[PDB]
Amino acid sequence: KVFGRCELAAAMKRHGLDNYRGYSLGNWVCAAKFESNFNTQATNRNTDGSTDYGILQINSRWWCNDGRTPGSRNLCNIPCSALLSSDITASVNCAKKIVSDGNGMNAWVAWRNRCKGTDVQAWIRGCRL
Ligand code: NA
């Protein structure tokens, strides 16, 4: 599913991402924009042979099982395919674990490079939340 910006904002808020670990909703929407362009089905291969899955490009190196990332962990205890569903519940639950790991949203390199320090409130502008 390709979410609308305000559609994804509402879904993230419903699932308790708004101000989770102190990150405002706009941070999460900005991260999803640059990770996936709001596409739940987004997959990208990393140089290390790990793969990033779903709206928040969660990495098989640590967080989900895809069976093809040698030496990897599955800390969200989920198949990486569950991160591609039209229902973002699994992505959000796993994102809560990632952002709690000690480096906050710096875990998402595209958040650090493209959202951090910017006017992230713009991403929820005009949304009925
Ligand atoms: Na894994």
Swiss-Prot record:
Alphabetical list of SUPFAM superfamilies matching this protein: Lysozyme-like
Sequence intervals crossing the membrane: none
Keyword flag Isomerase: no
Cell compartments where the protein resides: Secreted
InterPro entries tied to this protein: Glyco_hydro_22 (IPR001916), Glyco_hydro_22_CS (IPR019799), Glyco_hydro_22_lys (IPR000974), Lysozyme-like_dom_sf (IPR023346)
Enzymatic reactions: Hydrolysis of (1->4)-beta-linkages between N-acetylmuramic acid and N-acetyl-D-glucosamine residues in a peptidoglycan and between N-acetyl-D-glucosamine residues in chitodextrins
GO CC terms, sorted: cytoplasm; endoplasmic reticulum; extracellular space
EC number(s) per entry: 3.2.1.17
Domain C-type lysozyme: 1-129
Pfam families: Lys
Residues at the active site: 35, 52
GO terms of molecular function: beta-N-acetylglucosaminidase activity; identical protein binding; lysozyme activity
GO biological process, one term: defense response to Gram-negative bacterium
Family the UniProt entry places it in: Belongs to the glycosyl hydrolase 22 family.
Functional summary from the UniProt entry: Lysozymes have primarily a bacteriolytic function; those in tissues and body fluids are associated with the monocyte-macrophage system and enhance the activity of immunoagents. Has bacteriolytic activity against M.luteus.
Subunit structure: Monomer.
Name of the protein described by the UniProt record: Lysozyme C
Gene: LYZ
